[PDB]
Structures are given as C-alpha cells and as structure tokens.
Paper text:
Sugars and other sweet-tasting compounds are detected by the sweet taste receptor, a member of the class C GPCR family. To address this gap, here we present cryo-electron microscopy (cryo-EM) structures of the sweet receptor in the inactive, unliganded state, as well as in the activated, sucralose- and advantame-bound states.
In the presence of sweeteners, the human/mouse sweet receptor adopts two distinct conformations, which we refer to as compact and loose. In the compact conformation, the VFT LB2s remain packed; in the loose conformation, LB2s of the two subunits disengage. Advantame also yields well-defined ligand density in the TAS1R2 VFT pocket of both human/mouse and human/human receptors. Advantame engages TAS1R2 Ser144 through polar contacts, and its hydroxyl and amine groups form hydrogen bonds with conserved Asp142, Asp278, and Glu302. Although its interactions with TAS1R2 differ from those of sucralose, advantame elicits a comparable conformational change: the bottom of LB2 lifts by up to 8 Å, and the clamshell opening decreases from 112° (apo) to 104° (compact) and 103° (loose). The closure of the TAS1R2 VFT clamshell induced by sweetener binding leads to the formation of salt bridges between LB1 Lys65 and LB2 Asp278, which are brought into proximity in the compact state and engage further to form stable interactions in the loose state. By contrast, in the compact state, the inter-lobe interface remains largely preserved relative to the apo state, with the distance between the LB2s changing by only 0.7 Å.
Author numbering:
A (entry chain A): 25 to 44, 58 to 340, 358 to 555
B (entry chain B): 23 to 353, 367 to 388, 392 to 561
Write the structure that this text describes.
Amino acid sequence: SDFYLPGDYLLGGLFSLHANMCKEYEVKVIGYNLMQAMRFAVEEINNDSSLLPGVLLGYEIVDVCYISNNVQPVLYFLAHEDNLLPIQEDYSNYSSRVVAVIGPDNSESVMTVANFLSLFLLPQITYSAISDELRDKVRFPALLRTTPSADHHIEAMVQLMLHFRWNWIIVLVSNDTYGRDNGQLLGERVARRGICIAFQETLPTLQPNQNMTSEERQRLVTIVDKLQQSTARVVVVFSPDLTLYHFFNEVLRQNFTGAVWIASESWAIDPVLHNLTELRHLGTFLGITIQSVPIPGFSEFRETCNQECDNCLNATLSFNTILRLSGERVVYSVYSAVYAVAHALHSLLGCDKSTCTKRVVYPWQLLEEIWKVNFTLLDHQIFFDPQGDVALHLEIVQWQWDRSQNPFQSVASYYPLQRQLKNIQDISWHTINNTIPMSMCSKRCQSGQKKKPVGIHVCCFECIDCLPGTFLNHTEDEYECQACPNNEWSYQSETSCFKRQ
Amino acid sequence: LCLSQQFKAQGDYILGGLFPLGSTEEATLNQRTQPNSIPCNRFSPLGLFLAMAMKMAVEEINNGSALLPGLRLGYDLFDTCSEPVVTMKSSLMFLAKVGSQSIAAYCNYTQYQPRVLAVIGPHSSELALITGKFFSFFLMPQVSYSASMDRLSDRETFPSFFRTVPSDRVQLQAVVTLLQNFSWNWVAALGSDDDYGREGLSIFSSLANARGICIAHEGLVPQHDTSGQQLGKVLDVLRQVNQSKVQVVVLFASARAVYSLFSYSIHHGLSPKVWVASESWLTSDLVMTLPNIARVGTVLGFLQRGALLPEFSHYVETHLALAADPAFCASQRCPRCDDIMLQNLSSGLLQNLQLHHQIFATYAAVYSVAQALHNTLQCNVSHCHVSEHVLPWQLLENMYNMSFHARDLTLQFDAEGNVDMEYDLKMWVWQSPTPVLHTVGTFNGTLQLQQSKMYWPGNQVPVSQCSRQCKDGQVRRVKGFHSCCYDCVDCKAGSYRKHPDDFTCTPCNQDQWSPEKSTACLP
Ligand SMILES: COC(=O)[C@H](Cc1ccccc1)NC(=O)[C@H](CC(=O)O)NCCCc1ccc(OC)c(O)c1
C-alpha cells in the first residue's frame, strides 16, 4: 500500500488527508498531493546512486485529521519497534522506529507534536506551518521549516497595498486560532505603515455542505451588509478554504461586486474554491503563496490505524489537469524537507560518495547535522536560519479562469532575505478601463487647504481652507495654518503669503 | 527534614498529582542539545502548600466513611518544574503500565490499564493545554485548579478535562453584565500582550459584539516595560483612548502591565476614567502603592468568593514539625524539599494563612474525584461493588452529572467541565486615609447589585454612549472596531439630507437655500 515502505532508516510522515475515527471525513486533494510529493522524493533518493549509496531510505506515513489524531502517530513513531516505549531519565542511547518526522501541515498540530518530540529531540520538519511562535527554539528545539513564516506573508501584503496606495482596508478572520493570530499580526504591521483598517469581523465556522441555520445566515447577512456600506473596497481574508463556500455565496446573494480580495496562503491556491465560476463577477482575487519550482517528472508520478484512504485516487483524478497546469508550489517544500533529511543523514554516516557504513542513528545527532546542511537542490540553496527557517521566495498570484492555461498567474515576487516585494507585472483588474482600483478614506486636499482629523483613523481627515491672512507651510504641518508676516497677506486658497498692507 | 518522602502513599486507587514544587535554576533556560535530564532544585513554597492541601483531603477521605467505605485511597505527586519537558516526563509515568517502567502504543486506547486513577492538574494554563491534549487521548480524567483559559472548555479537543475554578468567560460575562446595567455602551478594551490578555480580549470582544456593546479600540499593552519602543506603543495606546472620547476602560491585563500603565498615567496625569479590572490585577497591592492614585478614577472588578479552610494552617504546621523530627524518617520525590527548615516558610507565606482559593480548589478537586469513584462503585453506606477494578474512562461518565460536597459548598461540573461558582463585585474606597476594597454586589449568573453603595467620583454616574440610530436631521458616520456605532452630524444650512440612510450631507443647488438640519433644498 501507499502509506508504508521498508528500508534501513525510516522517515515518519504526517499529512492531513481528510478535512474537518478519521476515515469518514471528506478527502482534501492538497494533502494527497503533498503525500505524493514525499513519496516521489524518497523514490528519487533510492534511485540515485550519489546521495545514499547502498542505504535504503524508507518511509511510514500516518493521516492527521487536523487537530484530531495527533498523539497516536507520535507514540507509534517513538516506539522501540515492539510497540513498547521505555521511560528514562536520559535518552541519548535510545533508538526509535523513525529517525526523522516530516511534520504536520498546520501550526496547532505542529506544536502539539513538538511538545512531545522536544523530549526526545527527534528532528521535526514542517513544510507549511507559518506561525511565528515556532521560531522559539527554547520552546521548540527540534523544529525546522522549509517555508517562510507569517511575518513575511504580512510584509508582502503590506508592500502590495503600499504599491497601489490602498490606505483603507477590511480584514475578515475565521473564528479560530489561525484567523485570530494573523488578524492581530496584520493589525501590528498595518498601523506603523500608514494603512488603516476600516473594520474587522470574525466569520462563523460553517461546514461547506451543512444546512445553514437562520442565526448563522443572519450573521453572514450582517457581515456582507457592513461590507456593502463601507467605502473600503479592499478585503483581506484569513480563513480556511472550507468556510468561504457559504460566505462567497452570500456575497453573491447580496449582489456585492467591485472589491479586491487578498487571499492568505490557506486558500490562495485552493483548486476547489477556484472552481466556483461565479466568483469571477465579485472582483479581483490576489493571493500570497510560496514560489513555483517545477519538479522534473513529478506530474508523471502523481498519475496500523489511520494508514489508509479509499477515495484519494478517485478524488484526485478530476483535478489532475488543474494541478498539472499549476506550479508545484507547496510540493517543493515537502521534497526539499526529504532531501534535507537525506543530506543530513548522508553527513551523519560520515559517508563517502562510494559507500556508506551502516550504524545506529540516535535522532539527536541527526538533528545536530540538519542544522548544518547547505546544498543546491534544483536551483535554490536550502539552508536553515538560526531560527530554523529556509529562505524560499514568496509570490503574489492572480486567479485566472481560462482553463486552457495556468490558473494562478504570478504577478509579483517577494524576497525574504531582502524583505522586499519585486518585479510587479500587469494585473488585469475588474475596473471598466483597467485603471488601478483604490481605497482611501478621504481625497487628497488641495493647495492652501489644511487637514483636520475626523476620528481615530489617521487616514481620515477633512479638508479646510486656510482663512485669508494665514498660509499653509505643508513642510511644517499640514493640519495647521500659519499667520502671515505683518508686511504680507494671503488669499483664500494659496500656499504662501505675498507683500501687502 | 523528612518531607519529600511523604509525597507517595499506598492505596487501592491512586490519585496522580502535578504541582509547582519547584523550578529549574534560572541559567538552565537555554536550548537543549542532547536529551539529558533537567535539574529543578529551586524549591517553591506554593507547590508545597498545594500538595499539603491534597494530602489533607485524601487523609480526611480515609478517616471518614461518607465516601468509599472500607477501602483505601492513595496518591502519587510529581513536580511540574514549570517545564514542559519535565511535565511530559512525569505525565508519561502516570500512564505507564501497572508496576512497569514503560508505555505501549495501541490504536483504540479504551483497552488499557494505567497506574493511576486520575490526575490533579497542573497549575499554569500552558501546561494545562500540553497535558490535556495528552491525557484525553487516554481519556484519563484531569481535574485542574488554577487553569482558567477558555480554550480548555471545548469538549471536542479536551473531552476529559475538568477544573474547580471558573473559566475567564464567567468573569467577562459579569463584566459585560455590569456594563449593560450602567448603560456604558461605548468602551475601550485593553489586555496584556501575554497569552492571558490575548484570550481575554478575544472573549470580551466577542461577547460585547453579541450583547450590543461597541469596542472603540482593542489594544494590547506591554507585559513589562524595558524599552523606549514599548513606552512608545503604550503611550500611543493611552492617547488613542483619549482620542476615542471613551470614559470606561476594560483592562483585562496582568498586574505588571497595569502597574506600568498607571505609572505613566500618574506621571503625566491623563484624565480620570472608569477601569474594570481583571481579577488578577484587582487582587494586588502593587498598583495601589502608586502615589495619589485617586487621580486615576474608580477601579472596579469581580472577585471569587471561596470558602474557609482554617484547619489547614495547623495541619501544615504539624506536618512541618513532624518533618523536622529526625526519628520521623522511619515514617525521594522532590529536589531539595528536604533542605527547607521552618524559617524559610514561617518568615513568609505561612503568615498569610488568593493562595487560599487555590488551596480550596485543590481540596475540592480531590473530593470531586473521590465522589466520582464513590458513585462508580455504587457504594452503599457499608458496601461497594468492588468485584471489578475501575478504569479511568469509566469515571469519566459519572463525573459529568455528579455533585460533590467541598466541605461546605455543593459543586457540580457543567456539561463542559466547569464548576458553577459565584462572584463578589468590589470597588476601591478612596475616601478613607488608605485605599480599601468594599463589596457592592454579587454575580451568581445574575448581577444582584447594590446601587446605594456606589461612591462615584463626581457624585454622579459616569456615562459613555454612542448612537446606534440617527435622527432625520442628522447624517451618519460609522465608528468602532467592528463598525458597531454611529455618531450623527447636523447637516448644515445650505445643505440637506438626501435620504435617511445616506452617508453624505448634500449641498443645495446654487440658486436655492435650505434651513439648518433641512430635509429639502428650496427656491
Ligand atoms: C489552524 O490553521 C488552519 O486552520 C489552516 C488550514 C489547515 C487546517 C488543517 C490542515 C491543513 C490546513 N492552516 C494552514 O493553512 C497552514 C498554516 C498554519 O496552520 O500555520 N498552511 C497550510 C498550506 C498548505 C495546505 C496543506 C494542507 C491542506 O489541507 C490538508 C491545505 O488546505 C493547505
């Protein structure tokens, strides 16, 4: 079966195949894609004579239902091959079933596992968990990442908004940890950079095919009403893809149109939401995601409890075309994580590129080695920061709906080492003549016309003419009119005084 | 002294216990490179007192016969060391097989025998989460003092977690009820930037939105002041309060942050406001030491009303005197507990006998577990159905619908694992030569409040309104972190109200005029 492969050393793999016992939930295609990514990476390493000569690399993969079924896979990985796990003062000489764990896909599962593996210092690499809390290596000594953190995603969003001068935005978050965290983080970033959040709302947690009750429906009605009333036409959504199925259908019910939707990675490249053709009429969709790296030949490969999935293959076959036209974005993180483990093991065995000596691997030594790897995988170097992150590029993608070509066009690229957004290309807007849409609380004042604030938001101000005899030195203060010298006078609407009685 | 030797006792059923008996020496708080054991020699009296409370409860249960007639209840206590690694080490030994040094991996775990019946939970919320996710896979009941985070209410992820302290949501419900009672509709929310304020702010904002109270702004404040940037952000927050024209501030922040805020406010005065306190702040003298605090304006909050345990003091002193006896060694589970001669304790907290609430909560947790077992064995006044050895997942069914007698109080866990317990409402009296807390109401699910004892500073009730409807003659502008409020602008002469739902006062045509607050543009 697909979930197991023997070898000399076994990699543990944790993926969330099913959404929402864990078989009975609906299957998510992205998780199966990532699992196949790991399988392909191990296949390459076993075929290649260079990296681990004569040493078989195996894997053992277990399903994780989001926050469910997190303890049992860890206990299974840590057992001493006879299902017993001894308790000891010191573990330096202990030998677990797996030498490394390719950790879960979400922050809460990652932290749940890390609080366990931190005891054993069994290395955990997570490919898609973005929370910035994971940088605490006193709290999470065994944890590394092949993906940038939420810091860089929010920085990319901020620089995107600054480039197009979107001062006035709406933030929508889910009713759970991820939305709360990212909303507060964006609140931190926005305030110091001259942008203002008009209002924030917590969306209800709705199952996509559940019959929505009256209370939930009127909650959604209220949210869309607030959207319709506000002058802020730019919307940021921090939510799992599952809950947006009802929200966007309500937005369609209210005949709302004309916004720019900024998608966080959790849904920026979801093929399922992308297949809702009716979203085309809402406005422009932009999203933050990891860079595209074309894995050569992975598409051709893509063609004891909780280690099974019946629906996975049948569910994936229909999306195969869309996944093939896409850029293999998050797949690369899993592939690079497997290769990082492989290189670290290659160094730990002290292996020459002829043959390796075979010896017992205590995981803490493999963790020792993983911190030091530095190699070119396809073009990009992958090495770990002192805080455990790998500096992969991020990209801003626009959704396209011509099914014959790439569904997620890249329109900007972000560099985390430079902390800069770069190489912005032609976005095709929803506007009547493709002019850049904007969102500002108030229009730019004229010359000779001071500002006067309306409220808490620095972005909102009245424009008031300086009375005759006073002038507006904008270089000193735009909110105050200065008095002219006794030998000069000023008109109703001019910047500086002139000689007059 | 013979003290650490007292923390384990034999019995037919054994209660596990996690306590802050100490902590690792401070320099040890650095990254692990190799999975060695961790030292924890920094003894603490707080954990000692709590463990003594648990031992007292179990000894009382063994003495009497109102519970578990004719059979013996024991205990086995481990230190958390306030350290996740050591906590996990200790937590695993609870679930290890009977009389064995190992734990086994199985698919469906309702098949298994651990070496303890239930675990009296850890002190801090972080460890409460860490262990609750672990124990509830084994469905071992965990009864926690001192853990109040609302995250642990969820039955889906913490199905076996119980606690003998109210969740923070109850206190925030009391707060919102107070705000409703005084019609303070327009308020500012502040919380410490630690996790406690994070959770509190989220819960308070959601409740306020649900009940129709509009948060002007939602600011995190520094848990401690160390940099000019943190001073900058807190001063920015405080000026943002003034910009909002809010008069009532809900400050759900740990004591250090509030002390910082009020230090600045005393230095440069700000202006008097109504402050609704986190219970953790209201308990402390630290804030009240600040000079001439009456400048601040009224401080209010809700306080938990625990029962007395007077016998506990003499119990602790008796057992310490016994521990000092070298012959009592004939009567290993803690580092350096045995070094603590009585001066270290009698010069300090022993003279204090909020620690009281945790002592009572530990006592009540032990009694709750004992009552649950008493139910599961279906004991008569003199008989029990002991033919089969009980398993932890069997207690879990009985605990959701029992009631247990915590020596005077009758308590029961609600459907999501919390005790129903009431509060006092207290207000700082400043008319006396020194600040004094005085009781002016109670919350037992409804706010039974005594108006005549509210000494407001202006001798009149404060107000903070916002408009949620606007008249015919006034145009709307939205405000609030959730667009909850409006305020209405008088549309001036020469302009008119276009229609009653619009957001723009409209100038009248050049050949025409209009009165003040006009609905029409006239020849
Ligand atoms: C609490 O977080 C969340 O609820 C969301 C949604 C989620 C829940 C459970 C399992 C996966 C995702 N988390 C994220 O999106 C995390 C960020 C973080 O969690 O730090 N980035 C994953 C990006 C690639 C991805 C992989 C697996 C997918 O489905 C199995 C999927 O849809 C997307």
